Write a protein that binds this ligand. Sequence first.
Ligand SMILES: Nc1ncnc2c1ncn2[C@@H]1O[C@H](COP(=O)(O)OP(=O)(O)OP(=O)(O)O)[C@@H](O)[C@H]1O
Ligand SMILES: Nc1ncnc2c1ncn2[C@@H]1O[C@H](COP(=O)(O)OP(=O)(O)OP(=O)(O)O)[C@@H](O)[C@H]1O
Ligand SMILES: Cn1c(=O)c2c(ncn2C[C@@H](O)CO)n(C)c1=O
Ligand SMILES: [Ca+2]
Ligand SMILES: [Zn+2]
Ligand SMILES: [Zn+2]
Lengths: 146, 742, 49, 48
Amino acid sequence: MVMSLLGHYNNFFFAAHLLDIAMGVKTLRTILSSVTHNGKQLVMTVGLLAVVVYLYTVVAFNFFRKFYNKSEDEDEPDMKCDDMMTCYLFHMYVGVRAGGGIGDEIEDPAGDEYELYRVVFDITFFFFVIVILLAIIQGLIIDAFG
Amino acid sequence: CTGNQQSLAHSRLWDAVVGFLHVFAHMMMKLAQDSSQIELLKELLDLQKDMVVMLLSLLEGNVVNGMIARQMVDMLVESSSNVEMILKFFDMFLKLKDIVGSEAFQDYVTDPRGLISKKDFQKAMDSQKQFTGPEIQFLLSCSEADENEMINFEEFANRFQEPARDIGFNVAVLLTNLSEHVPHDPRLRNFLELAESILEYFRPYLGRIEIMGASRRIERIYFEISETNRAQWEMPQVKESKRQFIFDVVNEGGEAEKMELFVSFCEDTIFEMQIAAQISEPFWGELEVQRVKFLNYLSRNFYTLRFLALFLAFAINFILLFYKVSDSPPNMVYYFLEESTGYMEPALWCLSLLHTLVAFLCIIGYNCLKVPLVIFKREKELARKLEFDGLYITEQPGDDDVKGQWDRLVLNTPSFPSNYWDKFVKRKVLDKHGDIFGRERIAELLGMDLASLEITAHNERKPDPPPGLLTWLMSIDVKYQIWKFGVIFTDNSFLYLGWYMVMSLLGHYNNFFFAAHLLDIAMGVKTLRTILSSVTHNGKQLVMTVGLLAVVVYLYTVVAFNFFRKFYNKSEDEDEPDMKCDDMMTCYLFHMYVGVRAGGGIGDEIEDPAGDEYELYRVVFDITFFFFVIVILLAIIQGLIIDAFGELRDQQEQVKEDMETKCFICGIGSDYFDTTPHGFETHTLEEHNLANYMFFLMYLINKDETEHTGQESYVWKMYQERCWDFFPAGDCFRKQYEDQLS
Amino acid sequence: GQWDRLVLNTPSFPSNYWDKFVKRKVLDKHGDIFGRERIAELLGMDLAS
Amino acid sequence: ELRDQQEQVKEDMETKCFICGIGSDYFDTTPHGFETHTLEEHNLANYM
Ligand SMILES: Nc1ncnc2c1ncn2[C@@H]1O[C@H](COP(=O)(O)OP(=O)(O)OP(=O)(O)O)[C@@H](O)[C@H]1O
Ligand SMILES: Nc1ncnc2c1ncn2[C@@H]1O[C@H](COP(=O)(O)OP(=O)(O)OP(=O)(O)O)[C@@H](O)[C@H]1O
Ligand SMILES: Cn1c(=O)c2c(ncn2C[C@@H](O)CO)n(C)c1=O
Ligand SMILES: [Ca+2]
Ligand SMILES: [Zn+2]
Ligand SMILES: [Zn+2]
């Protein structure tokens, strides 16, 4: 009702009524219930992802900050990890979406004293966050179906 | 003694019991009149208890519809009137208690001092309607009413109930036993209906178990359970430990091992109850008792302290987010927070100090609460091995068992079983194996002076030492302390908490270290433990998968070095070329790093071979890389994780449904019991309740041996021997007497 | 339970539930112990009626 | 599939004798019955 009433104000609100298909159809109820069955576990997985990204962000701030220039132009440089919040948002957002990890989005450390530490940093990020955590999600969903 | 039992049954004892019942009942009614006679009434109740014990001992060993039980039923029938009188006495006073506790009685009460008049008591009782008018008159006469005619209902109710408890429980036990062993005497039904209130009141306190008989036929035992013991059982942490034990035994517990493990779990429980009782809340000694109260409060609030520490870690990290770096002060850069308020920087310092304090208090609380249990278990198993295995006497450790090598030390230590209750393990082991291995060698191993042993036995010796801190220092055993500290270092949880401490301490050096404390959520939350345990379950397999990935990437790297090296220029500029695979190490790092992260594979990151003689070989190279490394190996990881979820889920389901289907004790299927309605439920709750078994065990520990029945002594002897044959396996009272039962 | 506390006094109470005599049965059952008047006040029911 | 194969093999081995195929329950009616039956009555090692 409320969404229809607000749709009369702006017709765009009527799109929300499309979600009623879930209640309408048994099949959508089953598919969505598969997720709901493990919803708490999935949320806690998201929290763990936040924590691990935060720790990686701490490392980036302390030691790997220089490599976070995302601006081509030298005159105007944009450093994401000069600030903790910006570093955390950058990691959480770009790195998680990235298949390869944050390393794709930050400059290669070749010919640097910290190159080995950074490659460990990136590869561990890829394994723990890009790979396992998502894998936890898909495994929870599969467990729900079964 | 079956012959003595038959002789007594044929004896005139029955008539004597009848006379005692008549005198008992009438004397109770007369004696309740005046308070002064209450002591003689107490003696009378105790004598009735002794007679009931005699009767129960006669029952001992009686089969269903045994003639001894039938004769006792007949005696009860002949003495009925007295029986109804005694049961009415008991139920009347119990109802008096519950009614006076009732608010309605209070509302009838109109006196500031709380007393109730004869008339007001009469009105309230007849308004409850439980009591007939003659009963009200008897109660009023029993109540000492001052010349003002007012009564203190509190004392009136309280006086009678303490003495009646033991006799009432014994009567309920006798009635239950006779009812079960003679299912069909209607006289016994009428008695049970009369006594239901007593049976209801004592129902929780009664504990019923079944044991394998010395006569090689199942028997049933009824015993008392203390309210404190029950409550300690209901305490939630005991329940969590119980569920943990059930899960462990069901998943990996053999049937032969299972019952011994149950006994060990009950012993550990008993220790935990003792610890809970001591910590429970009700000038040097004054400071000491303040210290003791502080430690007890820490132990009580230990988990709350952990949650508080986690909250402080969260707050510290939230403040740390505003932290920032800049070259300019508010070539070395300056790190400082970016916040207008200015209150945070003091707040971060205060929070760090409080977090460190909380962590140290958690170390202390964990120590006091749990280390005693660990030492108790390790001392117990060591004592068991010495008593029965005689390992250090004969077998010796495998030399691959660091636990055995460490335990070698404590043997000489005098204090040794400080936490384990038995201090006589040394003497028993000596008496047992000195004949073979030499008494002197056992004495040297155990740090025990024979001559001292003999003198203590012959005569009592009291070298009382004056109290002194220096004298306590002299007393302390360095070696036992060393062994204890080794165990403390070995245990995992202490290591985690010490890690927490160390990280807080280093955080005081640099606040960034406080972030590590955020990982405590895994230990704090069951759900994170489950999710991470899913990975740990397959951790070795995952590691070996990583190793195989390294090997395959290495081989692909070899191919790149030999034949496909040219294609590895990662520099746009021709003047300065960067070739990764000119060197094996650089080629391997490049592959491992970029290619694995790449969804398409290394081909995305290396130049297309189009128009080259090696183009076909390279496309095969890249596509095989993509299939074997990018696709399958990760797929192995996700499949392992999925297998972990499924495995853990089926473990929980299996544990639960087996628990519900079969008894922990007999292993009989639920179907046999359920043939009768609610059969498995009744069998678990009353016939085979593990809680009742454990309650029986503590009942025997508290009880004096001389009072132990033949059954109790039989079970106690098997407990001391550690043989568990008495526990019923594949047999039950129902099955034994089934044809007789129907 | 806190919300249900209200409906007790309401006369209509078991409008949908078929039994309208639950009040009288509960009174007959527990008035001996808890007082008839208190049950009546709780249930919004006049004994005299 | 492999996991359920291992579980099936183990639990069948524990439930029934390699020799008679009798269920563990019949023996276990007497205490430790299946264990005794496998160790002494029906030990494949004893047969060999
Ligand atoms: N020998 C046994 N003793 C106790 N329970 C047994 C036994 N054999 C099987 N069971 C079953 O195991 C369960 C006992 O554990 P349960 O989880 O019920 O704990 P509880 O304290 O009895 O109850 P709740 O779970 O409600 O707290 C019961 O369902 C019971 O049927
Ligand atoms: N006919 C049988 N002979 C031997 N074991 C049998 C037989 N039928 C069933 N079993 C079961 O199979 C198992 C025998 O294999 P098991 O893995 O125990 O090897 P083992 O050498 O007996 O002992 P362990 O595994 O400790 O080395 C026992 O648990 C036994 O109960
Ligand atoms: C668990 N446990 C004990 O704790 C015990 C005991 N015998 C004496 N004690 C010490 C006693 O002080 C406990 O209150 N037995 C046989 C036993 O099994
Ligand atoms: Ca005795
Ligand atoms: Zn059972
Ligand atoms: Zn067999």
